[PDB]
Nucleic acid binder design. Structure first.
Ligand SMILES: [Mg+2]
Ligand SMILES: [Zn+2]
Ligand SMILES: [Zn+2]
Lengths: 87, 108, 1267
DNA sequence: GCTTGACAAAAGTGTTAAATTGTGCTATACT
DNA sequence: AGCACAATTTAACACTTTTGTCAAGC
DNA sequence: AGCACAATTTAACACTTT
DNA sequence: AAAGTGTTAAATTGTGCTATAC
């Protein structure tokens, strides 16, 4: 049965979620919310840049440069080394 | 060799939840033999008049909309297959013929 | 009550499903015979896989795809109708099909006995004619109209009869006028005679034809009216033309139909109380075959009357559909599809149902509709139970399709394949090799098998240590076998026990826990002492390794199932981890004494001193390291650290004979000192030659008196010294050691001369064929035994072939007699003896013909071994199943009943010699009464364990009979008590209060059944006794005391016993001449006094007659003795408490003579406790006690007639148990340990009962106090 | 820290042609 | 088999709207 | 294939018409 | 004396089982 639950993957996904929250907690208050709404880590449904700009009161280009700075901050080796093993 | 197989489908890994879920409204349909069925629906959804219920037979909504009989016909109901190949004058001059055979055979 | 069924199970109730229940489970009606699309491979709507009805194929996505996330759940997509939910509810929602014509359930029509036939009083041969459209059945008749209009109807009938007669006499007058015209116009002129005779003959012929055609149609018109005048419901009309004549004429007075709708109409007009009262009254008043039949019908009528059932569930109107994940459609790679063989039957049912629904609306003649309904009935019958009525439905390849009934039956059914025994994770298996340096609790493990076995533990520990970043790199590091993980595996493997198991698992010692230790290689290293328990040999056997995970399972492996906690056997009590084949001959070469050896005790004083003394065993070892001393030479050491025997310590010290440091001189060998240094410090010096029986006695005394950790270390030291001296013993086999007897030739010549005289007397004509066969058999048996004696007396006592036999290491003497000497007689394929016989030996070599003769028995033995080990597992299975609810329940029930033990009969004067079988019937019991000698005192008081010193004290006191408490007379409600059971043979102390002693008692009888070779004598005799059948060599017993008249007669026998009271004599007519009469006291014949239950012929008395005549306390003696005789004839010791545990489960029930008035059908087998309860209540509300006698029934019949319906269906006859559990609406309570195994609960025995698993554990305060 | 203008790709959306599926009919005589 | 015809589903394209990205600027 | 067992028939019976 | 007629035994069919692991 190939559509079954592999037991050593469902543990690894849980530890990946915990490590993801542990890495995202070292960021600031707004950039972590921008990432969690841009990729849908809290609700499951992703958002657009206008959807985050509606809740933060700015345009799409202000949200986009915040995201483009946060993704550069996450490519730091202190933030990339503990996540590189999961891919 | 091993021969893996799959019933076609997927297994997703969202951890389950039970508090925030988009809101739903309940319709109620009524079938022909007086049964009541409750169907949930999304709020942004046009609730239809007729629903194929759990009983196996169609049930309309509890309101009085009366949407459509949709003018559906019989199909061929023999006759039609008789009337399409044989005309009325050939039948009327035959049936009466047969009718007279009821008159002559009864008394000899 | 709980549809989710999560951990709250109080009962589990079965019952018939009405049509209101089938359309209540279901989530919609499947109405198309479609499974899946051919292009898009998506399930079609309203088909056998439809999403709408059974659920979503993908998790949280609808069919069209509008809703695809967990934010919408519980809602139904308004465009496609599929409720968005998990996707594994496709294996739990049902579905139903609405039949356009009713259909009878096949289990309730084609059973044995047929329940629909009993419920309607219709024959099954008539029921099959009705429901498969072959005969109309009258279902109602208006009696009032047929009563009062009968006169006008017969008056109108006489009109048609006289119309037939009038047309008859009109044609007869026409024939009369025609023959008058013939005999007028032909005879008006001159004519020939014979042609006029032919004319008058042909006129008579046509007149006869007229009156006889009229006679035939008159008889037809009489027959239809005679059929109408006797009309009644539940009739049959097989004519199929007479029914149309009854419908067009007198068609208003009745109704008739065909098939399942007519059966439904008969069930509608069925008053259960009238049939119940009539069936009650028939068995009360009448007798004969009519009474014996009505009990069978009263069973099913009372079943439908008592409960809240109704018979309308026997005919169906909606058919449920199993969810599509239990009959999947799996796409194998390569784009291939596999369906699960239930889809074709569902497709055929819905196909023929749709075609019937189309033929009815279209309007059709009756023949096509009846053919369609019969096809629908056969399709649903093929779905429910294939191959029962008619020929089975086949697929491609002429194989029968698998129906729903074939998922539950058999040794493949869901029941014995996937519910009672499963495949497990965290396990492996490998070949086994011998591990002679390990301790008893250890076992080697291959490091690859232990790395793959212990994978999550090492995957955790190498992340607790900084060796990997996370769990994924740890998994990759383990799968790549990086060199750091072997340092971590020894950390995570320490003190973590593993269960080792070897199939077949005959007794409970075939699963044992060991602690592991990593061993290079790929073979499991087993300890050389547990091989007796596993019955493992090292010629290629494989064993399985399981890993217990939780803390409870680790505690159970460390405390309950460790290898060094189970030394003795639960069957007999003998030590099973005793030394064997090599260790026995090592200790036998050690501790023997050779006279005249090197450095013996000389003394020849007068010119030189004794020169055989030694200051200590250290000086003797230093002497034996030179060439001066042999180990098996008699010397006189001075031991300062070994305790002397009681006879020597009594005269040396007496008041305190302690030996840590006090000296005493011992005349022994050196080898017995080096043996006794292995035994414990307080143990007395032995000074005997170590046989195997001596070592069994030594280990048995160590198990009785010393603690359990001393015996294991002693057994390990004994195996070490045994291997070290077996390798020095000098036991080799060469052909120069196989000494032939030097006078074999003259012995064979003398017996050949005797055989030649016998053959000469046969060829002369003196004695016939079978007599000379028997004479040759006797002569060559005497020749065989004489050459055996010559070979026995020729051999030296230190031969390597004869030392292995005499030390009890392995083998016996007869094989040695076949090695050097004579093979003897060889059996036939028939079983008789070949009168030749084989006079060569396996050292001289056989000839061609003697080898070809020997192959007969040598292959018959192998085939019998295979068939015998096939037969023994069935007996072990039945014995486990009949006796699983015999567990220890309380400490003492305080009964005073008890059996008596034979226990050392007198002699002829003679004080008292022991009974031979005391250690199996009187050892490990408890006293019911205080023993008393001849006015004496109480020598052994009530409630003692009856060990060795108590038995010797009872034998010294001169009392030869002891009333003993037992399990046949135990007084608890459910299970036995601890003091009634006695000492558990495996632990050596009293039994605990959770031991499942019924399963131990079944395994102790089932294990040695393979060594039972064989009126019957082998394993069929045990199978005959435990099934309680009537034997083929049935011997009659007496019914009363009196005098026996033995009469011959018409070439069999006659025996008539006349009483002394007197009364009616007893007469037994036909006893065949092969069954010889029976000796006890001359021998039986005539002029004889008979006892009450004396046996009259030799053979085997059936247990039913001895139960009926002598009561239960004698049938217990008979069953225990007749089983233990078969087990004693082959040298197997099973204690009688196991056979008593089995035998107690047979006599638990009574049969009913007279019902009284309390719900008990006559001839039914009810439990004794429930019978006494309903006879306790009956003194209130009118005293009429139900009368019943005790019955004795076999293990299959008792194991099938149990309360639990889930435990009985998993055993035998799953269909006919499941189909009368459902009629009675029988519920289960889950109290045995076969249903808790099925449902996944804890069994109620051992650590699963409440008083053991409700232990609260808290630190004592001083310690919480001191921390 | 944040907004505006401008541009380009991605996603819905409507319509329309094609491909795909469902259903009726074929008359020497045939049992 | 084989063909004819209606009903239905799909895919393809044109056109509009959303969503994202670049350079400038206070 | 067989071994056992329980349900379902030929036939073997006295009893009552004809 | 024939002719059924129902009740009582030997023949007659069907059902269920037949070890364990790789
Ligand atoms: Mg072997
Ligand atoms: Zn949908
Ligand atoms: Zn008791």
């Amino acid at each position: 049965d190939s559509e079954a639950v592999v037991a050593v993957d469902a543990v690894s996904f849980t530890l990946l979620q915990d490590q993801l929250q542990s890495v995202l907690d070292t960021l600031s208050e707004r950039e972590a919310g921008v990432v969690r709404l841009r990729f849908g880590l809290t609700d499951g449904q992703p958002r657009t840049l206008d959807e985050i700009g509606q809740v933060y009161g700015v345009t799409r280009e202000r949200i986009r440069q915040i995201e483009s700075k946060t993704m550069s901050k996450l490519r730091h080796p202190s933030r990339s080394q503990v996540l590189r093993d999961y891919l | 060799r091993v021969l893996r197989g799959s019933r076609l489908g997927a297994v997703s890994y969202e951890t389950d939840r039970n508090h925030d879920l988009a809101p739903r409204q309940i319709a109620r349909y009524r079938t022909d033999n007086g049964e009541e069925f409750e169907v949930p629906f999304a709020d942004d959804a046009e609730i239809p008049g007729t629903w194929l219920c759990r009983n196996g037979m169609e049930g309309t909504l509890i309101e009085g909309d009366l949407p459509e009989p949709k003018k559906v016909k019989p199909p061929r109901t023999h006759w039609d297959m008789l009337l399409e190949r044989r005309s009325i004058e050939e039948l009327e001059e035959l049936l009466k013929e047969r009718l007279e055979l009821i008159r002559s055979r009864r008394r000899g | 009550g709980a549809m989710l069924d999560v951990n709250f199970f109080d009962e589990l109730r079965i019952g018939l499903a009405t049509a209101e229940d089938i359309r209540q489970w279901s989530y919609g009606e499947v109405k198309k015979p479609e499974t899946i699309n051919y292009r898009t491979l998506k399930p079609e709507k309203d088909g056998l896989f439809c999403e709408k009805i059974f659920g979503p194929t993908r998790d949280w996505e609808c069919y069209c795809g509008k809703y695809k996330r967990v934010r919408f759940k519980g809602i139904i997509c308004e465009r496609c109708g599929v409720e968005v939910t998990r996707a594994k509810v496709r294996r739990e929602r049902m579905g139903h099909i609405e039949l356009a014509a009713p259909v009878t359930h096949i289990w309730y029509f084609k059973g044995v006995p047929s329940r629909l036939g009993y419920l309607l009083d219709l024959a099954p041969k008539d029921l099959e004619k009705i429901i498969y459209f072959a005969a109309y059945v009258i279902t109602s008749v208006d009696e009032e109209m047929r009563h009062n209009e009968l006169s006008t109807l017969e008056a109108e009938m006489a009109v048609e009869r006289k119309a037939v007669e009038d047309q008859r006499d009109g044609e007869l007058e026409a024939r009369a006028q025609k023959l008058e015209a013939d005999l007028a116009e032909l005879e008006a002129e001159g004519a020939k005679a014979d042609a006029r005779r032919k004319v008058r003959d042909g006129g008579e012929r046509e007149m006869r034809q007229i009156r006889d055609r009229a006679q035939r149609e008159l008889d037809r018109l009489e027959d239809i009216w005679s059929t109408f005048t006797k009309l009644a419901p539940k009739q049959l009309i097989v004519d199929e033309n007479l029914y149309r004549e009854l419908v067009d004429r007198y068609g208003e007075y009745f109704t008739g139909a065909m098939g399942a709708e007519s059966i439904q109409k008969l069930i509608e007009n069925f008053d259960i109380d009238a049939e119940a009262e009539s069936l009650r009254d028939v068995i009360r008043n009448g007798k004969g075959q009519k009474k014996l039949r009505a009990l069978k019908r009263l069973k099913v009528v009372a079943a439908f009357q008592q409960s809240g059932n109704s018979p309308m569930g026997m005919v169906l109107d909606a058919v449920p559909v199993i969810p599509p994940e239990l009959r999947p459609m799996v796409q194998l790679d390569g784009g291939r599809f596999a369906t699960s063989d239930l889809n074709d039957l569902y497709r055929r049912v819905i196909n023929r149902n749709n075609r019937l629904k189309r033929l009815i609306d279209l309007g059709a003649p009756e023949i096509i509709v009846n053919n369609e309904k019969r096809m629908l009935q056969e399709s649903v019958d093929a779905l429910f139970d294939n191959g029962r009525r008619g020929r089975p439905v086949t697929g491609p390849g002429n194989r029968p399709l698998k129906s729903l009934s074939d998922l539950l039956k058999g040794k493949q059914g869901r029941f014995r394949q996937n519910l009672l025994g499963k495949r497990v994770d965290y396990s492996g298996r490998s070949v086994i090799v011998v591990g002679p340096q390990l301790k008893l609790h250890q076992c080697g493990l291959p490091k690859l098998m232990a790395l793959e076995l212990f994978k999550p533990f090492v995957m955790k520990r190498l992340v607790d240590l900084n060796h990997a970043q996370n769990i994924k790199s740890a998994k990759r590091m383990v799968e790549r076998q990086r060199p750091q993980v072997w340092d971590v595996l020894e950390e995570v493997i320490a003190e973590h026990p593993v269960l080792l198991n070897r199939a077949p698992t005959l007794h409970r010692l075939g699963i044992q826990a060991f602690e592991p230790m990593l061993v290079e290689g790929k073979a499991i290293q087993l300890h050389p002492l547990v091989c007796e328990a596993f019955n493992a040999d090292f010629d290629g056997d494989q064993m399985a390794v399981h890993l217990p995970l939780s803390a409870e399972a680790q505690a159970e492996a460390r405390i309950l199932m460790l290898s060094s906690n189970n030394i003795l056997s639960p069957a007999s009590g003998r030590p099973l981890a005793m030394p064997r084949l090599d260790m026995v001959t090592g200790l036998y070469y050690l501790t023997t004494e050779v006279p005249g050896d090197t450095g013996e005790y000389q003394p020849a004083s007068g010119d030189h001193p004794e020169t055989g003394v030694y200051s200590s065993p250290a000086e003797a070892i230093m002497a034996a390291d030179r060439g001066v001393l042999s180990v098996r030479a008699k010397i006189k050491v001075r031991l300062t650290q070994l305790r002397p025997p009681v006879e020597i310590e009594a005269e040396l010290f007496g008041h305190s004979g302690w030996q840590p440091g006090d000296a005493w001189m011992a005349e022994t060998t050196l080898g017995r000192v080096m043996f006794n240094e292995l035994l414990p410090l307080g143990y007395p010096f032995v000074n005997k030659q170590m046989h195997k029986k001596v070592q069994a006695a030594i280990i048995n005394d160590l198990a009785e008196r010393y603690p359990m950790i001393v015996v294991a270390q002693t057994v390990d030291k004994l195996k070490d010294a045994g291997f070290y001296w077996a390798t020095r013993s000098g036991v080799t086999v060469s052909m120069a050691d196989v000494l032939v007897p030097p006078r074999k030739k003259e012995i064979l010549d003398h017996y050949e001369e005797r055989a030649d005289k016998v053959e000469k007397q046969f060829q002369r004509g003196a004695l016939n064929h079978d007599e000379r066969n028997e004479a040759l058999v006797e002569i060559w048996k005497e020749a065989t035994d004489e050459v055996g004696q010559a070979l026995r007396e020729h051999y030296p006592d230190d031969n390597p072939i004869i030392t292995i036999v005499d030390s009890g290491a392995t083998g016996n003497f007869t094989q040695t007699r076949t090695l050097a000497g004579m093979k003897g007689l060889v059996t036939n394929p028939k079983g008789e003896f070949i009168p030749r016989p084989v006079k060569s030996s396996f050292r001289e070599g056989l000839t061609v013909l003697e080898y070809f003769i020997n192959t007969h028995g040598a292959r018959k033995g192998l085939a019998d071994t295979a068939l015998r080990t096939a037969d023994s597992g069935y007996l072990t299975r039945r014995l486990v199943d009949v006796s699983q609810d015999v567990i220890v329940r309380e400490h003492d029930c305080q009964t005073e009943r008890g059996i008596v033990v034979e226990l050392a009969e007198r002699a002829p004067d003679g004080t008292l010699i022991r009974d031979p079988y005391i250690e199996t019937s009187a050892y490990a019991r408890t006293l019911g009464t205080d023993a008393v000698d001849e006015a004496g005192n109480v020598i052994v008081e009530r409630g003692q364990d009856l060990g060795d010193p108590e038995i010797d004290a009872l034998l010294a006191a001169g009392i030869t009979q002891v009333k003993v408490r037992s399990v046949l007379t135990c007084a608890t409600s459910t299970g036995v008590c601890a003091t009634c059971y006695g000492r558990s043979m495996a632990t050596g102390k009293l039994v605990d209060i959770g031991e499942a002693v019924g399963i131990v008692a079944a395994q102790s009888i089932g294990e040695p059944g393979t060594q039972l070779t064989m009126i019957t004598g082998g394993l069929p005799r045990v199978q005959e006794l435990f099934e309680a059948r009537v034997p083929r060599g049935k011997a009659p017993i007496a019914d009363v005391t009196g005098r026996v008249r033995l009469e011959d007669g018409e070439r069999f026998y006659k025996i008539t016993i006349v009483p002394d009271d007197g009364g009616e004599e007893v007469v037994y007519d036909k006893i065949s001449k092969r069954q010889r009469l029976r000796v006890f006291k001359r021998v039986l014949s005539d002029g004889d006094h008979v006892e009450v239950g004396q046996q009259l012929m030799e053979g085997s008395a059936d247990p039913h007659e001895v139960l009926r005549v002598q009561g239960p306390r004698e049938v217990q003696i008979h069953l225990v003795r007749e089983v233990q005789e078969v087990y004693r004839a082959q040298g197997v010791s099973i204690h009688d408490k196991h056979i008593e545990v089995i035998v107690r489960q047979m006599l638990r029930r009574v049969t009913i003579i007279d019902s009284g008035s309390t719900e008990f059908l006559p001839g039914s087998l009810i439990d004794r406790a429930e019978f006494e309860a309903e006879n306790r209540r009956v003194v209130a509300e009118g005293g009429e006690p139900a009368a019943g006698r005790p019955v004795l029934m076999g293990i299959t019949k008792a194991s099938l007639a149990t309360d639990s319906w889930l435990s009985a269906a998993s055993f035998q006859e799953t269909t006919r148990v499941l189909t009368d559990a459902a009629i009675n609406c029988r519920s289960d309570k889950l109290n045995g340990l076969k249903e808790n195994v099925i449902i996944g609960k804890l069994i109620p025995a051992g650590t699963g009962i409440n008083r053991y698993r409700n232990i609260a554990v808290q630190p004592t305060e001083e310690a919480r106090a001191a921390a």
